[PDB]
Structure 1
Amino acid sequence: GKIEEGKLVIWINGDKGYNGLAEVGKKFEKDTGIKVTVEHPDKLEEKFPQVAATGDGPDIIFWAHDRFGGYAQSGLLAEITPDKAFQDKLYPFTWDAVRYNGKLIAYPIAVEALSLIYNKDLLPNPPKTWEEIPALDKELKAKGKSALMFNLQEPYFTWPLIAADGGYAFKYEYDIKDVGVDNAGAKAGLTFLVDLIKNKHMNADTDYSIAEAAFNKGETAMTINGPWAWSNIDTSKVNYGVTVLPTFKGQPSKPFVGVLSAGINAASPNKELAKEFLENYLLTDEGLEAVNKDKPLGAVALKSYEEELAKDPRIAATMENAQKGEIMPNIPQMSAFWYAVRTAVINAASGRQTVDEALKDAQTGSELYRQSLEIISRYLREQATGAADTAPMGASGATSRKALETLRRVGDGVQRNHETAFQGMLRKLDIKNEDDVKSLSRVMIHVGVTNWGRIVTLISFGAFVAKHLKTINQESCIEPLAESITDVLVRTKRDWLVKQRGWDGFVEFFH
């Protein structure tokens, strides 16, 4: 393929200890004579699937575990198979974070959680609540200081506040259909954030570099950040502490907890070299120390070394916050969830959208895959078998139910009129089984200006193909067909779909 044999290319994010990781690479190189190269590309979490989708990219990819389910779903990750003895060296719950559809898809490295980081010289007793921060900022401003600065350009940092009074991503009691991005709890949290901005206690333009600089220069009493940030604070000589996030409406802030993880490119011809590196060089006391001494990892997955790091009050703080939060899902639409909420926070903070409308859009964006799949899967199946699914629609049931009713009505005419066209198209494609389904969805996408009619024709071809698959005793292929059409639709037409308020707009358009 495109990835070079006999060497290792490793990608890790720019806020992590990539110089320390390179030291581990240098030791691997010394032992074996095999080159290891560490890179930290911009927009890593977007660059990796771009290049890997064509069989290119790094042998080894590092990111929090939340992104890896999507990567695995898209066929970009190799299944990893550590022996029992190696598995038992790491905490079982860290392997859980990197299991997808029953398979391990990455090596867990470390548990990351956000904490409140405060300047002990300015603020010897950090606030226990978010609510007292406006008053604290007024006191500090009289001294030429501010109370709090953190990255507002990434939803990770604001999420703890959103989740505090009841906001959630996908319900965990998982029911993926149940999404809590625009409930009252999420709205209260984001509204508090926006009020801080409108009362000049924070600035909507604040990003990672700006907040880090302000804290490390001693201009702001507090920031919110993970363990990787501590190294630069050490260098700056600020007298800092790491503690529990403030409560909001008497409830703990609930950070989304990430497990830094290393995956192996499905297209790498160096999977055994990667395995050797990750298991016998990185995931050891010495390997993890080399990275940790560069930028702190947090609470590492390796039991032996975590027993040492656990005595650190900053790690104790980290795990305190982690226990109040929640391990991230790794479902394939986590990416779409984060994009949706990123846009909602930035738009609300800038005043481009009200909090209510911003979160409504993030709700629709986060629900889009599962809602679309429910409708499309049911349509394809009932079209293939001739009989409807009588199972309850579930959450947002009126929308799914009314969209399916609309799709049946409009779809009947589209299929009748396009029958000749569809027959010709199918014949040219030679679709025999599930391996043909992947390529099919892509071609279906292309075959300009977005409108619902074009989307009905797309789905109707899907139904036509579903009937064919049923007829040739490949009824098992219908659900991956449905999943593939859905993925194509919601990814390529995301912004338009959200602008229509999703399937509610479809129902309204054809009323």
Structure 2
Amino acid sequence: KIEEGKLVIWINGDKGYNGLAEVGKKFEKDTGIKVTVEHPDKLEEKFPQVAATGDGPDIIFWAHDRFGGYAQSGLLAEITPAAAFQDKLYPFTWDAVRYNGKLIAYPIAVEALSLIYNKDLLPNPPKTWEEIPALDKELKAKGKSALMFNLQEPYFTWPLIAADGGYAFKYAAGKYDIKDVGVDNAGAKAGLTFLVDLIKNKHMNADTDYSIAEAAFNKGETAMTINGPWAWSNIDTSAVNYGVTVLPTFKGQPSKPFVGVLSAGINAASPNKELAKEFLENYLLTDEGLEAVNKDKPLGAVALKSYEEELAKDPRIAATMENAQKGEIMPNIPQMSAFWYAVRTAVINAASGRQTVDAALAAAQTNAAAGGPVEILPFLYLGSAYHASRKDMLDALGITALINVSANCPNHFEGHYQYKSIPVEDNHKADISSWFNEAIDFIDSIKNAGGRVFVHSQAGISRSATICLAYLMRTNRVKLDEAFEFVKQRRSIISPNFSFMGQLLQFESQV
């Protein structure tokens, strides 16, 4: 389907694909090269499939962070635009399309969260997070609230957590250090603590999600929300008198939202790389090219300096770009999935008082850096609650059964694995050894059917490691120091709390 002398472009269905086709039409009038724009479903998943066979589109448009993986698989051509062309785009957008120190796409558009406020309830929106409690108390007296936004998804709370020093993975040169996580430093702690205090003082409710915050703001019940350009249409329909502005500061520093950069990459299998360069550099990434796309469906803020200066006459787009430049580019590596799950658990757990802020972030720091489940024995694997939520990752290991060593974590797939629950907390009060025999019996019953057990707890560090150590001691009639050395050899971070270690030693006396 990919042929010399032709260009096929894939772009998602919610973008201005008709405006893009107009550009392709002008490219064909000037060059004789015909351009076909397509918007297939799940195109971000089809592309790595068709491209590994040497097929697919010539050009693919998608958010930059999906391209780091593509570039790892060698599916994206390296581009080398001249310095004069690079100077047409904001420098920070070129950092979003860097992989292993080589450019692998053209930045197109720029998107980030902003602060949205109701000019009737709040003519003077706050510049700092620290002002919001007093603002909330005055609005509550009139039956309103200061601020509602989606507290379930860490994407929405990260700008506050990052403000005083949190970061995902440390970025140095052109590579992220997946062993250097910044969710447990003092800035991250200071930001989460401020958020949790808003909840315990009743300025916000920990149950607020995307639709609850949207309905509240769009009906005039709360003075502010935190949201992105995809939400403006519904606010316009609601007819609220709103403005869009810079996110509040925290401890005098800007909130740092993650940035998504819509990008155009060139298929490494393409026989038309020079034509793709000509189309993208000489036609699309110009005032006329972006405008045609933008007239179809707005791009938001754009990476092209000259057209962004025109679009930012809309103060909402100016606010998006301003928040983006104070924020951080979304890391383009596959470890982001475990990061997001780790932080989402910490904020939920800290907001509900289930964990202290420090313990919640200490766990998130471990999980954000963790690998996959660790093999202890061929039928016995050790890992975290994150792993237990990934059905295909477990199936790839041949897992047939899970031991859930936690009080609150749910069993996600009761039709596809056998579950055993060990509902203990990770503290010096918990009597985990009263579950040893039941856990050991369950593992043996799975093993005798030729199954495999995945033992997990929140961090895969204390509770689940204790269960695996108990199994090894009883089954192999070995002492704790031997079983403990064996497991530390497969995952050095395991560490039962010292009360659990004491129960393990007392268990050995009885085996």
Q: TM-score range, shorter-chain basis?
A: 0.5 to 0.7
Aligned residues: 396
Give the Cα–Cα distance (whole angstroms) in 1 for the partners of residues 208 and 298 of structure 2.
24
- Structure 2 length as normaliser, TM-score? 0.63
Higher strand share: 2
Give 2:19's aligned residue.
23
- After superposition, the Cα gap between the structure-2 partners of 1:109 and 1:147, relative to the gap in structure 1 and judged at 3 Å, is same
Q: Which residue of 2 aligns with 1:500?
A: 460
Q: Quote the offset at 1:88 in angstroms.
A: 4.5
C-alpha distance in structure 1 between counterparts of 2:294 and 2:75, whole Å = 28
Match of 1:288 in 2: 290
Partner of 1:157: 156
Identify if the C-alpha distance between structure 1 residues 67 and 203 changes in structure 2 by more than 3 Å, giving closer, same or farther: farther
Gaps of 5+ in 2: 29-33, 379-392, 403-452, 463-490, 506-511
Q: Deviations over 1:3-51 (max 9, x none)?
A: 9x9674524385xxx2x3333225525865654222565xx87787688
**Residues 131-188 of structure 1: per-residue CA shift (max 9 Å, x gap):** 3323323332343432212233332221111012322223358655332212232223
Q: Per the alignment, in what secondary structure is the counterpart of residue 250 of structure 2?
A: coil
Q: What corresponds to 2:245 in structure 1?
A: 243
1:36 and 2:37 matched: yes
- Segments of 5+ residues of structure 1 without an aligned counterpart are 377-406, 415-441, 452-492
Secondary structure of the corresponding residue to residue 306 of structure 2: helix
**Residue 109 of structure 1 contacts residue 260 of structure 1 at CA under 8 Å; is this kept in 2?**
yes
Q: TM-score, normalised by structure 1?
A: 0.63
Shift, 1:87, TM fit: 3.9
283 and 195 in structure 1: CA distance in 2 versus 1, 3 angstrom threshold: same
Structure 2 partner of 1:122: 121
Aligned 1:190-269 pairs, distance under 5 A: 190-266=192-268
DSSP 3-state at the match of 1:308: helix
Task: Check the 8 A contact 2:55/2:269 in 1, yes or no.
Answer: yes
Distance 1:275 1:323, change over 3 A: closer
What SS class does the counterpart of residue 225 from structure 2 fall into? Answer: strand
Query: Do the aligned partners of 1:29 and 1:36 also contact (CA within 8 Å) in 2?
Result: no
Mapping for residues 107-506 of structure 1, pairs under 5 Å: 107-171=106-170, 176-266=178-268, 278-293=280-295, 296-349=298-351, 353-368=355-370, 446=397, 448=399, 496=456, 499-501=459-461, 503-506=491-494
Provide the rounded CA distance (Å) in 2 between the counterparts of 1:36 and 1:112.
Answer: 23
Q: Helix, strand or coil for the counterpart of 2:259?
A: strand
Judge conservation of contact 2:19–2:296 (CA < 8 Å) in 1: no
| Residue pair 1:121, 1:239 contacting (<8 A) in 2 also | yes
- The alignment-based identity, stated in percent, is 80
Distance 1:184 1:102, change over 3 A: closer
SS at match of 1:132: helix
Higher relative contact order (CA closer than 8 Å, sequence separation 6+): 1
Aligned amino acid, residue 24 of structure 1 = L
Secondary structure class of the residue paired with 2:127: coil
Tell me the residue number matched to 1:427.
none
1:208 and 1:11, CA in 2 relative to 1: closer, same or farther beyond 3 A? farther
1:353: Cα distance to partner?
A: 4.9
**2:231 partner amino acid:** A
CA distance in 2, matches of 1:197, 1:51: 48
Amino acid paired to 1:299 = A
**CA distance in structure 2 between the partners assigned to 1:293 and 1:65 by the alignment:** 22
| Distance (whole Å) between structure 1 residues aligned to residue 40 and residue 6 of structure 2 | 17
* CA displacement at 1:109 relative to structure 2: 1.0
Give the match's secondary structure for 2:146: strand
Q: Are the aligned partners of 1:24 and 1:281 in contact in 2 as well (CA < 8 Å)?
A: no
Mapped to 2, the partners of 1:21 and 1:266 lie a distance apart of: 22
Give the deviation of 1:273 after TM superposition. Answer: 6.9
- Residues 25 and 35, structure 2, Cα contact 8 Å, conserved in 1: yes
Tell me the SS of whatever aligns to 1:501.
Answer: coil
Query: CA offset at residue 69 of structure 1?
Result: 1.7
Alignment check: 8 A CA contact 2:23 2:284 kept? no
Equivalent AA in structure 1 for residue 347 of structure 2? V
What's the CA shift string for 1:194-240, capped at 9, x where partnerless? 33334443344434344334323333211112344334434443222
SS at match of 2:95: helix
- Return the offset for 1:95: 2.0
What do residues 443-499 of structure 1 show as CA deviations (whole Å, max 9, x unaligned)? Answer: xx7593699xxxxxxxxxxxxxxxxxxxxxxxxxxxxxxxxxxxxxxxxx9995963
Describe the superposition over 1:259-317 as per-residue Cα deviations: whole angstroms up to 9, x where unpaired.
Answer: 22233455667767765654455423233224444654343211321232344433443
